Amino acid sequence: VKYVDKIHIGNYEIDAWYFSPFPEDYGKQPKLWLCEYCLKYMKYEKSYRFHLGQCQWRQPPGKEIYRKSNISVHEVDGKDHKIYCQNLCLLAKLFLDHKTLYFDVEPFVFYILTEVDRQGAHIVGYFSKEKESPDGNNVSCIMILPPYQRRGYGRFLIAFSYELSKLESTVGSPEKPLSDLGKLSYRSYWSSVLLENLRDFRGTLSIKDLSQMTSITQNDIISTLQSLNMVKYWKGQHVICVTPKLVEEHLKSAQYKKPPITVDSVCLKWAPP
Ligand SMILES: COc1ccc(Br)cc1-n1cc(NS(=O)(=O)c2ccccc2OC)nn1
Ligand SMILES: [Cl-]
Ligand SMILES: [Cl-]
Ligand SMILES: [Cl-]
Ligand SMILES: [Cl-]
Ligand SMILES: [Cl-]
Ligand SMILES: [Cl-]
Ligand SMILES: [Cl-]
Ligand SMILES: [Zn+2]
């Protein structure tokens, strides 16, 4: 059984990282061809070119809940746009080892990140979120397509997931296990948020305060502070321990970069459930 090993999407040809359970006949051709707008998968260059002349979509379905300059997020309910969401999950599984759901998409909402030009809104990546998470996960799966990786889009989508959690007045954590890139992306985000907050705030913040302010879990704050040498243990409790000196050193170092893209609360049009 030959697996899908290469996709064509828009102007990109991208090699697979992992098995994805596209129907067996789809793996048999040299490439799988995806409409970059509706995510229809096609077996042939000729069916793909036909489709691109006929397909009217120039953006994701659902509602554009965020737009600032040419960066857009669409919110897509798995129940309302099932085929689109299944197509997105099969695409995602080519680049995610640990994603296990592709067809049963109704329980999830999908947040699609696009970069816009005069042709259309071009998919960069997404995250999925359970409508009802028994564990308080604010992200189920998160993926950036290879050509956009390590360019700030992952940090943006993580920031976006916590902006939703903050509007819901809840803490959340990504569902584990995380991708290798995901682990790096999350520690970098958490490090950046915690240091920026400790800098900007006049006076002392606790771990519980930082959790309420950021919607990061106390556990994720603790592991991040451990990585920054900014926490002590005292009679069975983690206690924040930092000087504005050490915060400034971290912010002024090569280990911290200003976010390329930030989430502007003003550009987010979203009411919590
Ligand atoms: C949640 O991130 C992912 C989850 C799954 C998969 Br597959 C990819 C990603 N991801 C993230 C990033 N981009 S970034 O902006 O976070 C970033 C910027 C600078 C340096 C390193 C970075 O990331 C390591 N690109 N891929
Ligand atoms: Cl590639
Ligand atoms: Cl292939
Ligand atoms: Cl459209
Ligand atoms: Cl999954
Ligand atoms: Cl499934
Ligand atoms: Cl990875
Ligand atoms: Cl918590
Ligand atoms: Zn299409």
PDB file of C-alpha atoms and ligand atoms in Angstrom:
ATOM      1  CA  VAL A   1       0.000   0.000   0.000  1.00  0.00           C
ATOM      2  CA  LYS A   2       1.819   3.196  -1.200  1.00  0.00           C
ATOM      3  CA  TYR A   3       1.258   6.168   1.197  1.00  0.00           C
ATOM      4  CA  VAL A   4       0.719   9.797   0.012  1.00  0.00           C
ATOM      5  CA  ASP A   5       4.309  11.159  -0.038  1.00  0.00           C
ATOM      6  CA  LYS A   6       3.919  14.578  -1.715  1.00  0.00           C
ATOM      7  CA  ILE A   7       1.127  17.201  -2.053  1.00  0.00           C
ATOM      8  CA  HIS A   8       0.649  20.137  -4.379  1.00  0.00           C
ATOM      9  CA  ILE A   9      -1.206  23.037  -2.724  1.00  0.00           C
ATOM     10  CA  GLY A  10      -1.340  26.456  -4.405  1.00  0.00           C
ATOM     11  CA  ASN A  11       2.177  27.115  -5.752  1.00  0.00           C
ATOM     12  CA  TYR A  12       3.863  24.667  -3.285  1.00  0.00           C
ATOM     13  CA  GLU A  13       4.892  21.020  -3.572  1.00  0.00           C
ATOM     14  CA  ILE A  14       5.414  19.683  -0.008  1.00  0.00           C
ATOM     15  CA  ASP A  15       6.868  16.276   1.056  1.00  0.00           C
ATOM     16  CA  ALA A  16       4.906  14.255   3.668  1.00  0.00           C
ATOM     17  CA  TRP A  17       6.335  13.717   7.190  1.00  0.00           C
ATOM     18  CA  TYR A  18       3.787  11.034   8.247  1.00  0.00           C
ATOM     19  CA  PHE A  19       1.122   8.605   7.119  1.00  0.00           C
ATOM     20  CA  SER A  20      -2.342  10.116   6.636  1.00  0.00           C
ATOM     21  CA  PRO A  21      -5.358   7.869   5.929  1.00  0.00           C
ATOM     22  CA  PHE A  22      -6.464   9.279   2.590  1.00  0.00           C
ATOM     23  CA  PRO A  23      -8.327   6.546   0.647  1.00  0.00           C
ATOM     24  CA  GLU A  24      -5.908   3.879  -0.717  1.00  0.00           C
ATOM     25  CA  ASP A  25      -6.342   4.933  -4.416  1.00  0.00           C
ATOM     26  CA  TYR A  26      -5.144   8.529  -3.525  1.00  0.00           C
ATOM     27  CA  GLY A  27      -1.686   7.183  -2.459  1.00  0.00           C
ATOM     28  CA  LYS A  28      -1.140   5.415  -5.826  1.00  0.00           C
ATOM     29  CA  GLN A  29      -0.281   8.568  -7.918  1.00  0.00           C
ATOM     30  CA  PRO A  30       3.073  10.476  -7.724  1.00  0.00           C
ATOM     31  CA  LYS A  31       1.325  13.467  -5.993  1.00  0.00           C
ATOM     32  CA  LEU A  32      -1.950  14.400  -4.292  1.00  0.00           C
ATOM     33  CA  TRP A  33      -3.287  17.774  -5.546  1.00  0.00           C
ATOM     34  CA  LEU A  34      -5.209  20.018  -3.081  1.00  0.00           C
ATOM     35  CA  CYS A  35      -7.368  23.089  -3.846  1.00  0.00           C
ATOM     36  CA  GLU A  36      -5.751  25.696  -1.534  1.00  0.00           C
ATOM     37  CA  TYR A  37      -9.221  27.276  -0.853  1.00  0.00           C
ATOM     38  CA  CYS A  38     -11.755  24.365  -0.423  1.00  0.00           C
ATOM     39  CA  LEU A  39      -9.071  21.656   0.356  1.00  0.00           C
ATOM     40  CA  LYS A  40     -10.606  19.201  -2.120  1.00  0.00           C
ATOM     41  CA  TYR A  41      -7.929  16.502  -2.799  1.00  0.00           C
ATOM     42  CA  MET A  42      -7.508  15.304  -6.420  1.00  0.00           C
ATOM     43  CA  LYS A  43      -5.498  12.487  -8.041  1.00  0.00           C
ATOM     44  CA  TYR A  44      -4.357  14.152 -11.300  1.00  0.00           C
ATOM     45  CA  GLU A  45      -2.780  17.396 -12.514  1.00  0.00           C
ATOM     46  CA  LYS A  46      -5.657  17.604 -15.073  1.00  0.00           C
ATOM     47  CA  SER A  47      -8.506  17.198 -12.502  1.00  0.00           C
ATOM     48  CA  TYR A  48      -6.694  19.774 -10.290  1.00  0.00           C
ATOM     49  CA  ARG A  49      -6.393  22.364 -13.168  1.00  0.00           C
ATOM     50  CA  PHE A  50     -10.072  21.789 -14.106  1.00  0.00           C
ATOM     51  CA  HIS A  51     -11.086  22.322 -10.444  1.00  0.00           C
ATOM     52  CA  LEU A  52      -9.051  25.545 -10.114  1.00  0.00           C
ATOM     53  CA  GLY A  53     -10.957  27.062 -13.121  1.00  0.00           C
ATOM     54  CA  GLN A  54     -14.385  26.092 -11.652  1.00  0.00           C
ATOM     55  CA  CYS A  55     -13.968  26.509  -7.870  1.00  0.00           C
ATOM     56  CA  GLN A  56     -15.364  29.859  -6.615  1.00  0.00           C
ATOM     57  CA  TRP A  57     -13.863  29.746  -3.082  1.00  0.00           C
ATOM     58  CA  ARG A  58     -11.015  32.235  -2.364  1.00  0.00           C
ATOM     59  CA  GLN A  59     -10.996  31.818   1.429  1.00  0.00           C
ATOM     60  CA  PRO A  60     -12.022  29.317   4.113  1.00  0.00           C
ATOM     61  CA  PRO A  61     -15.708  28.772   4.923  1.00  0.00           C
ATOM     62  CA  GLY A  62     -17.155  29.922   8.263  1.00  0.00           C
ATOM     63  CA  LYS A  63     -16.817  33.395   9.799  1.00  0.00           C
ATOM     64  CA  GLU A  64     -13.733  35.708   9.572  1.00  0.00           C
ATOM     65  CA  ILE A  65     -13.345  36.410  13.347  1.00  0.00           C
ATOM     66  CA  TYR A  66      -9.951  38.176  13.050  1.00  0.00           C
ATOM     67  CA  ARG A  67      -8.530  40.494  10.394  1.00  0.00           C
ATOM     68  CA  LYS A  68      -5.529  42.827  10.820  1.00  0.00           C
ATOM     69  CA  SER A  69      -3.702  43.976   7.700  1.00  0.00           C
ATOM     70  CA  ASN A  70      -3.524  40.825   5.472  1.00  0.00           C
ATOM     71  CA  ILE A  71      -3.656  38.277   8.409  1.00  0.00           C
ATOM     72  CA  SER A  72      -7.070  36.564   8.844  1.00  0.00           C
ATOM     73  CA  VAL A  73      -8.530  33.801  11.092  1.00  0.00           C
ATOM     74  CA  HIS A  74     -11.757  31.964  10.129  1.00  0.00           C
ATOM     75  CA  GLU A  75     -13.780  29.969  12.705  1.00  0.00           C
ATOM     76  CA  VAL A  76     -15.229  26.800  11.101  1.00  0.00           C
ATOM     77  CA  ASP A  77     -17.610  24.481  12.998  1.00  0.00           C
ATOM     78  CA  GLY A  78     -16.945  20.814  12.141  1.00  0.00           C
ATOM     79  CA  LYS A  79     -20.736  20.176  12.201  1.00  0.00           C
ATOM     80  CA  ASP A  80     -21.503  22.922   9.591  1.00  0.00           C
ATOM     81  CA  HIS A  81     -18.497  22.331   7.195  1.00  0.00           C
ATOM     82  CA  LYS A  82     -17.778  18.595   7.635  1.00  0.00           C
ATOM     83  CA  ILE A  83     -16.017  17.826   4.293  1.00  0.00           C
ATOM     84  CA  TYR A  84     -13.815  20.932   4.522  1.00  0.00           C
ATOM     85  CA  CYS A  85     -12.850  19.985   8.111  1.00  0.00           C
ATOM     86  CA  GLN A  86     -12.160  16.309   7.204  1.00  0.00           C
ATOM     87  CA  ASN A  87      -9.966  17.516   4.283  1.00  0.00           C
ATOM     88  CA  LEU A  88      -8.091  19.869   6.688  1.00  0.00           C
ATOM     89  CA  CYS A  89      -7.541  17.021   9.220  1.00  0.00           C
ATOM     90  CA  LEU A  90      -6.112  14.630   6.510  1.00  0.00           C
ATOM     91  CA  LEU A  91      -3.788  17.458   5.313  1.00  0.00           C
ATOM     92  CA  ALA A  92      -2.769  18.115   8.986  1.00  0.00           C
ATOM     93  CA  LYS A  93      -1.978  14.401   9.620  1.00  0.00           C
ATOM     94  CA  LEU A  94       0.738  14.540   6.899  1.00  0.00           C
ATOM     95  CA  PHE A  95       2.723  16.818   9.284  1.00  0.00           C
ATOM     96  CA  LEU A  96       1.508  15.601  12.789  1.00  0.00           C
ATOM     97  CA  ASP A  97       2.575  12.270  14.312  1.00  0.00           C
ATOM     98  CA  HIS A  98      -0.005  12.251  17.147  1.00  0.00           C
ATOM     99  CA  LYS A  99      -3.286  13.462  15.521  1.00  0.00           C
ATOM    100  CA  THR A 100      -5.742  10.531  15.670  1.00  0.00           C
ATOM    101  CA  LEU A 101      -9.087  12.030  14.463  1.00  0.00           C
ATOM    102  CA  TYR A 102      -9.730  12.897  10.786  1.00  0.00           C
ATOM    103  CA  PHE A 103     -13.363  11.924   9.881  1.00  0.00           C
ATOM    104  CA  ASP A 104     -15.361  12.479  13.144  1.00  0.00           C
ATOM    105  CA  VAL A 105     -14.922  16.313  13.046  1.00  0.00           C
ATOM    106  CA  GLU A 106     -18.417  17.359  14.376  1.00  0.00           C
ATOM    107  CA  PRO A 107     -17.142  17.703  18.013  1.00  0.00           C
ATOM    108  CA  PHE A 108     -14.505  20.323  17.015  1.00  0.00           C
ATOM    109  CA  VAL A 109     -14.204  23.962  15.926  1.00  0.00           C
ATOM    110  CA  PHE A 110     -11.350  24.822  13.546  1.00  0.00           C
ATOM    111  CA  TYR A 111      -9.456  28.151  13.495  1.00  0.00           C
ATOM    112  CA  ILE A 112      -7.802  28.615  10.048  1.00  0.00           C
ATOM    113  CA  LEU A 113      -4.961  31.168   9.682  1.00  0.00           C
ATOM    114  CA  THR A 114      -4.602  32.777   6.217  1.00  0.00           C
ATOM    115  CA  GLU A 115      -2.305  35.389   4.663  1.00  0.00           C
ATOM    116  CA  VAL A 116      -4.263  37.457   2.091  1.00  0.00           C
ATOM    117  CA  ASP A 117      -3.263  38.920  -1.269  1.00  0.00           C
ATOM    118  CA  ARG A 118      -5.296  40.148  -4.292  1.00  0.00           C
ATOM    119  CA  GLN A 119      -5.794  36.467  -5.444  1.00  0.00           C
ATOM    120  CA  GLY A 120      -7.299  35.146  -2.155  1.00  0.00           C
ATOM    121  CA  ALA A 121      -6.752  34.077   1.487  1.00  0.00           C
ATOM    122  CA  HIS A 122      -3.913  31.496   1.490  1.00  0.00           C
ATOM    123  CA  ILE A 123      -3.917  28.840   4.248  1.00  0.00           C
ATOM    124  CA  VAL A 124      -0.871  28.912   6.585  1.00  0.00           C
ATOM    125  CA  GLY A 125      -2.054  26.618   9.357  1.00  0.00           C
ATOM    126  CA  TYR A 126      -4.820  25.966  11.876  1.00  0.00           C
ATOM    127  CA  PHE A 127      -5.755  24.703  15.274  1.00  0.00           C
ATOM    128  CA  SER A 128      -8.696  22.509  16.317  1.00  0.00           C
ATOM    129  CA  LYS A 129     -10.516  22.852  19.650  1.00  0.00           C
ATOM    130  CA  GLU A 130     -13.036  20.467  21.235  1.00  0.00           C
ATOM    131  CA  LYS A 131     -16.421  22.165  21.825  1.00  0.00           C
ATOM    132  CA  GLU A 132     -16.450  20.190  25.140  1.00  0.00           C
ATOM    133  CA  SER A 133     -13.008  19.299  26.518  1.00  0.00           C
ATOM    134  CA  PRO A 134     -13.156  16.934  29.548  1.00  0.00           C
ATOM    135  CA  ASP A 135      -9.507  18.078  30.313  1.00  0.00           C
ATOM    136  CA  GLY A 136      -9.640  21.865  29.658  1.00  0.00           C
ATOM    137  CA  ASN A 137      -7.612  21.714  26.479  1.00  0.00           C
ATOM    138  CA  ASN A 138      -7.752  25.048  24.606  1.00  0.00           C
ATOM    139  CA  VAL A 139      -6.105  23.380  21.545  1.00  0.00           C
ATOM    140  CA  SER A 140      -6.575  19.775  20.335  1.00  0.00           C
ATOM    141  CA  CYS A 141      -4.144  19.878  17.344  1.00  0.00           C
ATOM    142  CA  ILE A 142      -2.146  22.771  15.904  1.00  0.00           C
ATOM    143  CA  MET A 143      -0.188  22.709  12.607  1.00  0.00           C
ATOM    144  CA  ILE A 144       1.775  25.217  10.457  1.00  0.00           C
ATOM    145  CA  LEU A 145       2.497  24.085   6.871  1.00  0.00           C
ATOM    146  CA  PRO A 146       6.230  23.525   6.227  1.00  0.00           C
ATOM    147  CA  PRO A 147       6.847  26.578   3.946  1.00  0.00           C
ATOM    148  CA  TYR A 148       5.527  28.918   6.749  1.00  0.00           C
ATOM    149  CA  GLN A 149       7.343  27.198   9.666  1.00  0.00           C
ATOM    150  CA  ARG A 150       9.733  29.072  12.045  1.00  0.00           C
ATOM    151  CA  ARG A 151       8.409  32.460  10.735  1.00  0.00           C
ATOM    152  CA  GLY A 152       6.160  33.588  13.659  1.00  0.00           C
ATOM    153  CA  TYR A 153       2.811  32.081  12.454  1.00  0.00           C
ATOM    154  CA  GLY A 154       2.898  29.310  15.115  1.00  0.00           C
ATOM    155  CA  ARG A 155       3.451  31.858  17.919  1.00  0.00           C
ATOM    156  CA  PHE A 156       0.534  33.906  16.458  1.00  0.00           C
ATOM    157  CA  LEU A 157      -1.862  30.864  16.492  1.00  0.00           C
ATOM    158  CA  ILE A 158      -0.802  29.925  20.042  1.00  0.00           C
ATOM    159  CA  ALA A 159      -1.380  33.557  21.166  1.00  0.00           C
ATOM    160  CA  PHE A 160      -4.784  33.391  19.391  1.00  0.00           C
ATOM    161  CA  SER A 161      -5.762  30.178  21.297  1.00  0.00           C
ATOM    162  CA  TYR A 162      -5.059  31.967  24.666  1.00  0.00           C
ATOM    163  CA  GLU A 163      -6.982  35.121  23.530  1.00  0.00           C
ATOM    164  CA  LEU A 164     -10.061  32.838  23.192  1.00  0.00           C
ATOM    165  CA  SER A 165      -9.340  31.236  26.653  1.00  0.00           C
ATOM    166  CA  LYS A 166      -9.067  34.744  28.235  1.00  0.00           C
ATOM    167  CA  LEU A 167     -12.495  35.723  26.735  1.00  0.00           C
ATOM    168  CA  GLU A 168     -13.908  32.414  28.114  1.00  0.00           C
ATOM    169  CA  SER A 169     -12.437  33.348  31.609  1.00  0.00           C
ATOM    170  CA  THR A 170     -10.697  29.948  31.708  1.00  0.00           C
ATOM    171  CA  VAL A 171      -7.154  28.540  31.722  1.00  0.00           C
ATOM    172  CA  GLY A 172      -6.235  25.992  29.090  1.00  0.00           C
ATOM    173  CA  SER A 173      -3.349  23.883  27.826  1.00  0.00           C
ATOM    174  CA  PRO A 174      -2.730  22.217  24.456  1.00  0.00           C
ATOM    175  CA  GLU A 175      -3.630  18.514  24.342  1.00  0.00           C
ATOM    176  CA  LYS A 176      -0.575  16.257  24.702  1.00  0.00           C
ATOM    177  CA  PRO A 177       1.447  14.812  23.260  1.00  0.00           C
ATOM    178  CA  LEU A 178       2.782  17.944  21.439  1.00  0.00           C
ATOM    179  CA  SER A 179       4.883  17.943  18.208  1.00  0.00           C
ATOM    180  CA  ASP A 180       8.662  18.639  18.473  1.00  0.00           C
ATOM    181  CA  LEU A 181       8.052  22.075  16.837  1.00  0.00           C
ATOM    182  CA  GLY A 182       4.957  22.524  19.045  1.00  0.00           C
ATOM    183  CA  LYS A 183       6.982  22.050  22.242  1.00  0.00           C
ATOM    184  CA  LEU A 184       9.526  24.698  21.093  1.00  0.00           C
ATOM    185  CA  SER A 185       6.725  27.038  19.923  1.00  0.00           C
ATOM    186  CA  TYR A 186       4.791  26.771  23.231  1.00  0.00           C
ATOM    187  CA  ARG A 187       7.844  27.223  25.521  1.00  0.00           C
ATOM    188  CA  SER A 188       8.922  30.306  23.432  1.00  0.00           C
ATOM    189  CA  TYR A 189       5.350  31.773  23.687  1.00  0.00           C
ATOM    190  CA  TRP A 190       4.995  31.049  27.417  1.00  0.00           C
ATOM    191  CA  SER A 191       8.523  32.449  28.132  1.00  0.00           C
ATOM    192  CA  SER A 192       7.711  35.602  26.105  1.00  0.00           C
ATOM    193  CA  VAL A 193       4.290  36.211  27.769  1.00  0.00           C
ATOM    194  CA  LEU A 194       5.575  35.607  31.333  1.00  0.00           C
ATOM    195  CA  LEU A 195       8.661  37.854  30.947  1.00  0.00           C
ATOM    196  CA  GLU A 196       6.671  40.663  29.178  1.00  0.00           C
ATOM    197  CA  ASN A 197       4.096  40.549  32.073  1.00  0.00           C
ATOM    198  CA  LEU A 198       6.777  40.611  34.845  1.00  0.00           C
ATOM    199  CA  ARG A 199       8.534  43.581  33.023  1.00  0.00           C
ATOM    200  CA  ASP A 200       5.376  45.698  32.308  1.00  0.00           C
ATOM    201  CA  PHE A 201       3.680  45.129  35.766  1.00  0.00           C
ATOM    202  CA  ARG A 202       4.718  47.505  38.655  1.00  0.00           C
ATOM    203  CA  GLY A 203       5.097  45.300  41.787  1.00  0.00           C
ATOM    204  CA  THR A 204       5.208  41.503  42.397  1.00  0.00           C
ATOM    205  CA  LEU A 205       3.044  38.882  40.513  1.00  0.00           C
ATOM    206  CA  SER A 206       2.470  35.306  41.876  1.00  0.00           C
ATOM    207  CA  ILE A 207       2.055  32.108  39.750  1.00  0.00           C
ATOM    208  CA  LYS A 208      -1.745  32.240  40.476  1.00  0.00           C
ATOM    209  CA  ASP A 209      -1.839  35.938  39.317  1.00  0.00           C
ATOM    210  CA  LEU A 210       0.070  35.109  36.089  1.00  0.00           C
ATOM    211  CA  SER A 211      -2.414  32.241  35.384  1.00  0.00           C
ATOM    212  CA  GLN A 212      -5.476  34.541  35.791  1.00  0.00           C
ATOM    213  CA  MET A 213      -3.816  37.237  33.616  1.00  0.00           C
ATOM    214  CA  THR A 214      -2.629  34.929  30.763  1.00  0.00           C
ATOM    215  CA  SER A 215      -5.001  31.844  30.863  1.00  0.00           C
ATOM    216  CA  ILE A 216      -1.778  29.752  30.923  1.00  0.00           C
ATOM    217  CA  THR A 217      -2.170  26.846  33.434  1.00  0.00           C
ATOM    218  CA  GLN A 218      -0.226  27.068  36.704  1.00  0.00           C
ATOM    219  CA  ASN A 219       1.577  23.843  35.593  1.00  0.00           C
ATOM    220  CA  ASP A 220       2.694  25.408  32.259  1.00  0.00           C
ATOM    221  CA  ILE A 221       3.784  28.611  34.108  1.00  0.00           C
ATOM    222  CA  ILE A 222       5.783  26.491  36.611  1.00  0.00           C
ATOM    223  CA  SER A 223       7.592  24.454  33.935  1.00  0.00           C
ATOM    224  CA  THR A 224       8.403  27.717  32.052  1.00  0.00           C
ATOM    225  CA  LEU A 225       9.699  29.511  35.201  1.00  0.00           C
ATOM    226  CA  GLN A 226      11.837  26.374  35.933  1.00  0.00           C
ATOM    227  CA  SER A 227      13.347  26.728  32.394  1.00  0.00           C
ATOM    228  CA  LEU A 228      14.096  30.460  33.160  1.00  0.00           C
ATOM    229  CA  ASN A 229      15.572  29.769  36.692  1.00  0.00           C
ATOM    230  CA  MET A 230      12.759  31.936  38.161  1.00  0.00           C
ATOM    231  CA  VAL A 231      11.059  29.553  40.646  1.00  0.00           C
ATOM    232  CA  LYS A 232      11.972  28.083  44.072  1.00  0.00           C
ATOM    233  CA  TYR A 233      10.387  25.209  46.036  1.00  0.00           C
ATOM    234  CA  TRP A 234       9.337  25.891  49.622  1.00  0.00           C
ATOM    235  CA  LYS A 235       7.468  23.463  51.961  1.00  0.00           C
ATOM    236  CA  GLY A 236       5.836  21.661  48.988  1.00  0.00           C
ATOM    237  CA  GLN A 237       4.957  24.842  46.971  1.00  0.00           C
ATOM    238  CA  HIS A 238       6.466  26.401  43.818  1.00  0.00           C
ATOM    239  CA  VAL A 239       7.230  30.113  44.604  1.00  0.00           C
ATOM    240  CA  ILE A 240       8.175  32.678  41.918  1.00  0.00           C
ATOM    241  CA  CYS A 241      11.678  34.083  42.541  1.00  0.00           C
ATOM    242  CA  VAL A 242      12.971  36.731  40.109  1.00  0.00           C
ATOM    243  CA  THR A 243      14.636  40.193  40.042  1.00  0.00           C
ATOM    244  CA  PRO A 244      13.698  42.807  37.417  1.00  0.00           C
ATOM    245  CA  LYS A 245      17.470  42.371  36.569  1.00  0.00           C
ATOM    246  CA  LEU A 246      17.077  38.688  35.463  1.00  0.00           C
ATOM    247  CA  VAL A 247      13.797  39.481  33.554  1.00  0.00           C
ATOM    248  CA  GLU A 248      15.603  42.330  31.687  1.00  0.00           C
ATOM    249  CA  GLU A 249      18.610  40.019  30.897  1.00  0.00           C
ATOM    250  CA  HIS A 250      16.211  37.427  29.342  1.00  0.00           C
ATOM    251  CA  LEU A 251      14.278  40.094  27.328  1.00  0.00           C
ATOM    252  CA  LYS A 252      17.546  41.718  26.072  1.00  0.00           C
ATOM    253  CA  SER A 253      19.120  38.304  25.049  1.00  0.00           C
ATOM    254  CA  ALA A 254      19.165  36.480  21.633  1.00  0.00           C
ATOM    255  CA  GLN A 255      16.827  33.846  23.328  1.00  0.00           C
ATOM    256  CA  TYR A 256      13.942  36.425  23.030  1.00  0.00           C
ATOM    257  CA  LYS A 257      12.675  37.897  19.688  1.00  0.00           C
ATOM    258  CA  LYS A 258       9.858  40.482  19.344  1.00  0.00           C
ATOM    259  CA  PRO A 259       6.797  38.640  17.888  1.00  0.00           C
ATOM    260  CA  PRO A 260       6.609  39.192  14.099  1.00  0.00           C
ATOM    261  CA  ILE A 261       2.743  39.127  14.290  1.00  0.00           C
ATOM    262  CA  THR A 262       0.744  39.830  17.459  1.00  0.00           C
ATOM    263  CA  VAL A 263      -2.960  39.281  18.207  1.00  0.00           C
ATOM    264  CA  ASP A 264      -4.690  42.708  18.402  1.00  0.00           C
ATOM    265  CA  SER A 265      -7.767  42.336  20.752  1.00  0.00           C
ATOM    266  CA  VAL A 266      -9.258  45.231  18.680  1.00  0.00           C
ATOM    267  CA  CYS A 267      -9.194  43.081  15.468  1.00  0.00           C
ATOM    268  CA  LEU A 268     -10.859  40.021  17.133  1.00  0.00           C
ATOM    269  CA  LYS A 269     -14.688  39.788  16.613  1.00  0.00           C
ATOM    270  CA  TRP A 270     -15.619  36.863  18.953  1.00  0.00           C
ATOM    271  CA  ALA A 271     -18.112  36.194  21.778  1.00  0.00           C
ATOM    272  CA  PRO A 272     -17.410  33.223  24.099  1.00  0.00           C
ATOM    273  CA  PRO A 273     -19.968  30.344  24.444  1.00  0.00           C
TER     274      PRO A 273
HETATM  275  C1  LIG B   1       2.561  25.316  17.293  1.00  0.00           C
HETATM  276  O1  LIG B   1       3.638  25.151  16.335  1.00  0.00           O
HETATM  277  C2  LIG B   1       3.669  24.122  15.466  1.00  0.00           C
HETATM  278  C3  LIG B   1       2.957  22.958  15.668  1.00  0.00           C
HETATM  279  C4  LIG B   1       3.025  21.924  14.737  1.00  0.00           C
HETATM  280  C5  LIG B   1       3.820  22.035  13.612  1.00  0.00           C
HETATM  281 BR1  LIG B   1       3.887  20.637  12.334  1.00  0.00          BR
HETATM  282  C6  LIG B   1       4.518  23.212  13.400  1.00  0.00           C
HETATM  283  C7  LIG B   1       4.470  24.252  14.330  1.00  0.00           C
HETATM  284  N1  LIG B   1       5.238  25.413  14.070  1.00  0.00           N
HETATM  285  C8  LIG B   1       5.387  26.604  14.738  1.00  0.00           C
HETATM  286  C9  LIG B   1       6.196  27.373  13.942  1.00  0.00           C
HETATM  287  N2  LIG B   1       6.390  28.743  13.937  1.00  0.00           N
HETATM  288  S1  LIG B   1       6.650  29.643  15.288  1.00  0.00           S
HETATM  289  O2  LIG B   1       6.205  30.958  14.980  1.00  0.00           O
HETATM  290  O3  LIG B   1       5.999  29.068  16.411  1.00  0.00           O
HETATM  291  C10 LIG B   1       8.388  29.765  15.438  1.00  0.00           C
HETATM  292  C11 LIG B   1       9.038  30.966  15.151  1.00  0.00           C
HETATM  293  C12 LIG B   1      10.425  31.052  15.250  1.00  0.00           C
HETATM  294  C13 LIG B   1      11.160  29.932  15.613  1.00  0.00           C
HETATM  295  C14 LIG B   1      10.522  28.734  15.888  1.00  0.00           C
HETATM  296  C15 LIG B   1       9.123  28.639  15.798  1.00  0.00           C
HETATM  297  O4  LIG B   1       8.455  27.488  16.034  1.00  0.00           O
HETATM  298  C16 LIG B   1       9.178  26.354  16.542  1.00  0.00           C
HETATM  299  N3  LIG B   1       6.330  26.712  12.811  1.00  0.00           N
HETATM  300  N4  LIG B   1       5.933  25.505  12.997  1.00  0.00           N
HETATM  301 CL    CL B   2       8.986  20.059   1.361  1.00  0.00          CL
HETATM  302 CL    CL B   3       2.068  11.160  -3.189  1.00  0.00          CL
HETATM  303 CL    CL B   4     -14.745  33.203  -1.406  1.00  0.00          CL
HETATM  304 CL    CL B   5      -6.317  13.975  17.570  1.00  0.00          CL
HETATM  305 CL    CL B   6     -11.707   9.753  12.763  1.00  0.00          CL
HETATM  306 CL    CL B   7       7.567  18.679  14.559  1.00  0.00          CL
HETATM  307 CL    CL B   8      -4.254  26.033  36.485  1.00  0.00          CL
HETATM  308 ZN    ZN B   9     -11.700  24.236  -4.511  1.00  0.00          ZN
END
